[PDB]
């Protein structure tokens with residue numbers, strides 16, 4: 001009964017793995033072998049050519065342009081005034097993008113409100129693995145954010161930043177040629 | 178035959194649940210989080226009232242959580258090496274990993290050493306920011322702020338703010354508690 | 357159909373959680389209570405005793421030795437000329453290991469090619485939570501990489517490193 005369903009789900013896992021290996025030389029989570037990355041993206045209203053893994057969470061008002069790659073284990077949170085992301089962006093695995101915060105709410109024992117502020121990222125941006133972007137941040141166009149960064153403030157166009165907190169290292173012109 | 182019919186059925190369920198979650202709760206979740214409810218999972222694991230935990234969270238060994246605590250996606254709660262306690266009104270951000278064991282010696286010795294173990298505790302009224310890592314043996318008090326991207330290697334007293342890898346005390350946390 | 361399948365998937369979740377809690381003292385994501393970590397590893401061609409969570413992604417050519425533990429929320433990317441990993445390694449939760457990168461492709465508006473370089477990790481290595489290893493890196497044997505690290509350069513055998521970026525701290529002889 002339930003054990004038949006389990007056994008069938010196990011068979012589907014083995015077969016879908018064999019399929020993903022042969023056709024796309026990859027092995028993916030079960031969820032990612034049911035759900036299609038391009039269809040999910042369409043269904044959420046993102047630009048054509050944009051893709052999003054099953055493992056990604058998308059909250060509230062989020063806009064994404066064309067040909068933007070949204071990686072696995074990502075967070076796109078537009079619950080706090082909307083998140084807007086541009087075209088041709090790389091949103092690496094484990095990148096988290098926020099428009100709200102609950103620090104005061106926790107530290108006050110549940111009394112204080114949630115803090116909220118909108119966030120926007122331009123086009124032709126690269127957000128390295130495990131980048132955290134906090135609420136109220138504006139990122140310009142043609143920006144590189146290195147892996148593991150924590151972005152607490154606006155970044156101008158054509159900049160490379162990294163660190164916790166992220167600081168401006170230099171321009172990103174080299175990556176554009 | 179049935180393999181592909183089940184796939185179709187799962188695909189149809191996914192489309193219907195996504196469409197549903199988009200209109201009611203204004204969000205799109207992983208397949209797993211559309212079968213498994215965050216509140217029911219918390220209730221089942223014995224957690225306090227109003228506590229919630231995503232399907233993607235891993236809970237190993239002895240783990241207890243108080244009330245009104247938010248356990249985020251892609252989290253690790255590892256009580257396997259002597260018990261993990263987390264208090265009430267806590268924010269456990271996405272990607273936060275909390276441990277009571279590790280395997281460094283096991284690996285480095287070619288599989289011969291034991292797993293090392295130590296219980297871990299977090300108080301009430303704490304905030305652990307995205308991708309915070311808490312290692313075995315840590316005791317965190319009440320009303321602590323741990324900033325994003327931190328690696329906490331030692332006990333943190335109540336009413337403190339820390340961040341960094343490894344985390345250091347930056348100042349007290351009293352200003353965050355106000356009304 | 358749809359209501360029903362939903363209802364049965366829920367029932368199965370409750371029943372599997374109950375069984376995992378009693379038998380292995382754990383609660384796991386839905387997908388990790390379908391997929392067995394040792395079977396998935398075997399199917400992927402990994403060595404005997406290796407395990408990998410459902411939540412892991414493996415791209416391209418990836419070779420993994422015996423008795424290597426591959427944790428949840430991991431990325432093993434061998435798409436840019438192969439990733440090789442040795443025996444008895446701990447690949448903690450959140451670790452991402454790459455052989456490709458798309459910085460130029462994004463920053464050029466989709467014009468530039470994907471950059472590629474093979475990556476290698478020896479045996480008896482520990483990679484701490486959320487370690488990021490970039491393309492082209494060679495990690496020796498018996499290396500410790502501390503949590504929250506970004507590995508941008510080679511690491512010799514018997515070394516301990518950590519940081520973003522990762523720097524050498526000392527030898528790893530104490531852990532052996």
Ligand SMILES: CC(=O)SCCNC(=O)CCNC(=O)[C@H](O)C(C)(C)COP(=O)(O)OP(=O)(O)OC[C@H]1O[C@@H](n2cnc3c(N)ncnc32)[C@H](O)[C@@H]1OP(=O)(O)O
Nearest residue numbers: 098100101102134152164165268270306323324325340341
């Ligand atoms: C439950 C949920 O999901 S909530 C949503 C997810 N959370 C977020 O997006 C918020 C992420 N931010 C954090 O975790 C932050 O570390 C916080 C909010 C906990 C603390 O930040 P605050 O110190 O209040 O912010 P502020 O910008 O005022 O920073 C003050 C100083 O601390 C530094 N700083 C703050 N947090 C960090 C950090 N995590 N690592 C390093 N430095 C930090 C700032 O660079 C600044 O340095 P300065 O004194 O030289 O100016």
Ligand SMILES: CC(=O)SCCNC(=O)CCNC(=O)[C@H](O)C(C)(C)COP(=O)(O)OP(=O)(O)OC[C@H]1O[C@@H](n2cnc3c(N)ncnc32)[C@H](O)[C@@H]1OP(=O)(O)O
Nearest residue numbers: 276278279280312313342343446448449484502503518519
């Ligand atoms: C199978 C598995 O996945 S196991 C479960 C997950 N693993 C864990 O929870 C353990 C995570 N811990 C780590 O990654 C650690 O970096 C370790 C254990 C590999 C190395 O830690 P050790 O160096 O042995 O610990 P110790 O506390 O002695 O640290 C020595 C010094 O280096 C610093 N240090 C240690 N690890 C790090 C790190 N990852 N980043 C920065 N600094 C670090 C300490 O702050 C300390 O500095 P100090 O001399 O100024 O006080």
Ligand SMILES: CC(C)(COP(=O)(O)OP(=O)(O)OC[C@H]1O[C@@H](n2cnc3c(N)ncnc32)[C@H](O)[C@@H]1OP(=O)(O)O)[C@@H](O)C(=O)NCCC(=O)NCCS
Nearest residue numbers: 092128144145146147162163454456457458490508520521
């Ligand atoms: C964006 C990125 C490529 C920048 O790296 P880079 O600057 O080209 O590499 P370099 O070593 O030449 O960078 C120069 C300096 O920045 C430092 N650095 C680079 N990226 C850093 C980061 N994310 N955090 C901290 N320091 C960083 C280097 O250590 C070096 O410091 P130095 O002046 O002391 O020598 C890199 O930060 C990154 O995110 N890499 C991850 C790529 C990946 O695997 N992506 C997933 C697949 S799409």
Ligand SMILES: O=S(=O)(O)CCCN1CCN(CCO)CC1
Nearest residue numbers: 024037038039049050051069435
């Ligand atoms: O872009 S990915 O690296 O994820 C996949 C690599 C090649 N893919 C190109 C896009 N098609 C589908 C486009 O809709 C699948 C194959």
